[PDB]
């Protein structure tokens, strides 16, 4: 009974290695045409009244906002005599950066991003203080785009400097220790727009050096690789300031080349393309800089260690035969990151069965000295420089918004203190609990899954489920706090489940490879097996399951509704990649071929054509679940044409279907992008729409 917008069908046939593939809505790849703008407007004019028609929408938005309304803080970061920290009073669109001369001093406002936009659509993206704590570089993104403008302030006053760097994207921000400038990345001029609404592919990223007090036109091009247009040059200055560490990536695999430049030994100042020394001239393994003592550098690596380890490479004898293991690879746990504090102490964060653990090691020997206790959850923030003598770290979990710890690092015992407790106001979290189960996938592999629910739940199959997943790009989906999840559990009788499906990094690179490239179908099988597990164990039934995912998780949702529509009642795919044959042709999509492959390859196409959601919409005996696609017109990470073309094709496929009664809709937001830096007001509106859509499609019941 749903009337879907008109969408002109333009038969476009293309040959992929002998296989003819036809699509009908490629005109939606042009975001600037009147036809595409009319399609976007018509889809919003259909979904907005349907979402607003939810009878509990006001109650839902009010409760999400009330649960969300609590003071939030980042860890305090020391920079000289001043500490800097982000703080949100509760519902501010963007967090404010404060400065205080000591932990006990009254703070001053250092940078309020809310002062730059009436609707909070200007957000910070990347920050870096100078080594002498006197200057502060920061990136600004408009309307959620990946494009960045780098600006500068004096610290701690916050007074603006005139320096402005444009066309910055996916950029480093590394000050030289002479406090005279920094390294950053930018793209040269391109045809058309560069504001987040274009689909133009980004290649030939350059590394530049900007000197303070000069125009950007005077910046020195220090590194470029025109023979490898997809290479991206990460730049970092060593802790002592002597070395420029160049980490070169191609794609999204946890691997990188490792070059360096001895800045101090340079005969002259930075004036041209820098001559570098190659330490690792391949993409075989990761080499992530931790610290260095003179010429001996400590790196985190996955070289012959899928669960990661720490090695030492001395630039004075850099052949691989001289490398030494500093911290052995753990037999079970994944080493997520390491940080050096107080000259010769290391903070190592591990992931053990999708739960974070923290340990203190010695830099000289790599030997373990202590464990910092944590509850079941994730470490989402850290502060602790090599030159300072204490650390701060932020912990979060499903029922814990935040705990900020402080640990003195000057003694041989490491007893962390609670610095801040971040809690929801007037909410009894003791009524709920989290369980971790391991369910067998289609091939028999055991997959971890967190299930958050009310205590005393009986397994009668009556409870609605929000099933979340991602599955790809070495990303581990670890416990975190969500205010809307609390409302779902408290007022909508909900059960929330995360399936740690393959493709992620929960169990190392082998877990990642088991769900990428030719093994991508394993990811979808794991997620479908998660829904089957919840049904078989009577947590829920298929009609009560809502699946949700974003970006690569949006691809997960799209493939799962095509393959097993009988397993779900609702589906919410946010900013999802849905045309798997053309994703690599837009913006930064070429970097994802390390997990997806590319339709340019004959072998990769045979894999992609089987699960590309846009090309696998088929009516089955069971109707498709209710579908809500969410994207923004400035999502230049995953261009919104993915959602637009999928929406047009799925609405056409079921236009004459008697059996399809569930709605297939989409919401295209304005002045927002992939998600990072989205203002709080838009986030709450989006969560209200998600649970309003579920209430209208899977029969949720509101309880006050």
> Residues 358, 347: contact at Cβ < 8 Å?
yes
Q: Is 330 helix (H, G, I), strand (E, B) or coil?
A: coil
> In which residue are the tokens 């030159």 written?
387
Q: Is 180 helix (H, G, I), strand (E, B) or coil?
A: coil
> In which residue are the tokens 């400097």 written?
161
Host H or E run for residue 407: strand 400-408
| Residues forming a β-bridge with 335 | 350
Q: Please report, for residues 85, 438, 543, 623, the alpha-carbon distance to residue 377 in angstroms, rounded to integers and kept in the order given.
A: 22, 17, 31, 38
Cα(247)–Cα(300) distance, rounded to whole angstroms?
A: 13
What is the total residue count of the chain?
A: 704
Side-chain half-sphere exposure of 199, counting CA atoms within 13 A:
17
Q: What angle do CA 372, 378, 384 make, to 5 degrees?
A: 55
Could you tell me which of 24, 104, 14 has the C-alpha nearest to residue 649? 24
Complete DSSP assignment for 334-373: EEEEEEEETTTEEEEEEESSS-EEEEEEETTT--EEEEE-
Could you tell me which of 150, 258, 160 has the C-alpha nearest to residue 209? 150
Could you tell me which of 207, 200, 202 has the C-alpha nearest to residue 225? 207
Distant-in-sequence, close-in-space partners of 41: CB < 8 Å, separation ≥ 6: none
Cα(198)–Cα(194) distance, rounded to whole angstroms?
A: 6
Positions marked catalytic: 551, 635, 674
> Residues 616, 610: contact at Cβ < 8 Å?
yes
> Residues 173, 186: contact at Cβ < 8 Å?
no
> Residues 550, 472: contact at Cβ < 8 Å?
no
Cα(451)–Cα(437) distance, rounded to whole angstroms?
A: 8
Experimental resolution (Å)? 1.5
Cα(430)–Cα(520) distance, rounded to whole angstroms?
A: 38
| SS3 letters across 633-660 | CCCCCCCCHHHHHHHHHHHHHCCCCCCC
For the chain, list the domains and their CATH numbers. Answer: 1-70+424-704 (3.40.50.1820), 71-423 (2.130.10.120)
> Residues 79, 100: contact at Cβ < 8 Å?
no
> Two tokens at 559?
């493939």
Cα(222)–Cα(414) distance, rounded to whole angstroms?
A: 43
Taking every pair of C-alpha atoms in the chain, what is the biggest distance, in angstroms?
77
> Residues 223, 246: contact at Cβ < 8 Å?
yes
Give the other-Cβ count within 10 Å of 398's Cβ.
Answer: 23
Q: Please report, for residues 490, 687, 693, the alpha-carbon distance to residue 483 in angstroms, rounded to integers and kept in the order given.
A: 11, 10, 18
> Residues 436, 449: contact at Cβ < 8 Å?
yes
Q: How far is CA 271 from the centre of its chain?
A: 36
Could you tell me which of 401, 449, 431, 567 has the C-alpha nearest to residue 491? 431
> Residues 691, 487: contact at Cβ < 8 Å?
yes
Q: Please report, for residues 10, 126, 169, 608, the alpha-carbon distance to residue 206 in angstroms, rounded to integers and kept in the order given.
A: 39, 17, 10, 31
């Amino acid at each position: 009974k749903f009337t879907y917008p008109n969408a002109r069908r333009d038969e476009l046939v293309e040959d992929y290695h002998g296989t003819k593939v036809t699509e009908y809505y490629r005109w939606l790849e042009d975001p600037d045409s009147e036809e595409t703008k009319a399609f976007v407007e018509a889809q919003n004019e259909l979904s907005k009244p349907f979402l607003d028609a939810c009878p509990i929408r006001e109650k839902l938005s009010s409760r999400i906002t009330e649960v969300w309304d609590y003071p939030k803080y980042s860890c305090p970061g020391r920079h000289g005599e001043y500490f800097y920290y982000y703080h949100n009073t509760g519902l501010q669109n963007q967090s404010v950066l404060y400065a205080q001369k000591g932990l006990g001093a009254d703070p001053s406002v250092f940078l309020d991003p809310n002062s730059l936009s009436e609707d909070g659509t200007v957000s910070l993206r990347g920050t870096a203080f100078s080594e002498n704590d006197q200057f502060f570089a920061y990136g600004l993104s408009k309307s959620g785009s990946d494009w960045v403008t780098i600006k500068f302030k004096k610290a701690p006053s916050g007074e603006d400097l005139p320096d402005t760097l444009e066309r910055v994207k996916f950029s480093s921000m590394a000050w030289t220790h002479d406090h005279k400038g920094l390294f950053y990345n930018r793209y040269l001029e391109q045809q058309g727009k560069s504001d987040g609404t274009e689909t133009t592919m980004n290649v030939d990223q350059k590394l530049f050096y900007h000197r303070l007090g000069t125009d950007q036109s005077e910046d020195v091009l220090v590194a470029e690789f025109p023979e490898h247009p997809r290479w991206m040059i990460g730049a970092e200055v060593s802790d002592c300031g002597r070395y420029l560490v160049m980490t070169i990536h191609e794609g999204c695999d946890p691997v990188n080349r490792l070059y360096y430049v001895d800045l101090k030994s340079m005969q002259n100042e930075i004036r041209g393309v820098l001559s570098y020394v190659k330490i690792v001239d391949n993409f075989d393994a990761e080499y992530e800089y931790i610290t260095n003592d003179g010429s001996k550098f400590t790196f985190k690596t996955n070289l012959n260690a899928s669960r990661y380890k720490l090695i030492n490479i001395d630039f004075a004898d850099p052949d691989q035969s001289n490398w030494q293991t500093l911290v052995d690879e753990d037999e079970k746990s994944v080493l997520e990151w390491a940080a050096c504090v107080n000259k010769d102490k290391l903070i190592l964060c591990y992931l053990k069965d999708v739960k974070n653990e923290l340990y203190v090691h010695g830099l000289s020997s790599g030997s373990r000295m202590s464990q910092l206790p944590l509850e079941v959850g994730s470490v989402v923030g850290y502060s602790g420089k090599k030159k300072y003598d204490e650390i701060f770290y932020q912990f979060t979990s499903f029922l814990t918004p935040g705990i900020i710890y402080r640990c003195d690092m000057t003694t041989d015992t490491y007893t962390p203190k609670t610095f801040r407790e971040i809690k929801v106001k007037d909410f009894d979290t003791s009524q709920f609990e989290t369980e971790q189960v391991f369910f067998p996938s289609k091939d028999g592999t055991k997959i971890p899954m967190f299930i958050v629910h009310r205590k005393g739940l009986v397994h009668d199959g009556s409870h609605p489920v929000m099933l979340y997943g991602y599955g790809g790009f070495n990303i581990s989906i670890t416990p975190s706090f969500s205010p809307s999840r609390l409302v779902f559990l408290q007022h909508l009788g909900g059960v929330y489940a995360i399936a740690n499906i393959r493709g992620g990094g929960e169990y190392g690179e082998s877990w990642h490879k088991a769900g990428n490239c030719a093994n991508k179908q394993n990811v979808f099988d794991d997620f479908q097996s998660a829904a089957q597990y919840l049904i078989e164990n009577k947590w829920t039934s298929a009609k009560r399951i809502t699946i949700n995912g974003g970006s690569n998780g949006g691809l997960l949702v799209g493939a799962c509704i095509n393959q097993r529509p009988d397993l779900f009642g609702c589906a919410v795919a946010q900013v999802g990649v849905l045309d798997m044959l053309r994703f690599h042709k837009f913006t930064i999509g070429h970097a994802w071929t390390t997990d997806y492959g590319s339709s340019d390859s004959t072998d990769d196409f045979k894999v992609l054509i089987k699960y590309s959601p846009l090309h696998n919409i088929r009516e089955q005996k069971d109707q498709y679940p209710a579908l809500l696609l969410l994207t923004g017109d400035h999502d230049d990470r995953v261009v919104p044409l993915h959602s637009l073309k999928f929406l047009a094709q799925i609405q056409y496929t079921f236009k004459d279907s008697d059996s399809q009664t569930n709605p297939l809709m989409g919401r295209i937001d304005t002045k927002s992008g992939h998600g990072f830096g989205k203002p709080t007001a838009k986030v709450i509106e989006e969560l209200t729409d998600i649970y309003s859509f579920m209430h209208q499609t899977v029969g949720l019941k509101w309880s006050d």
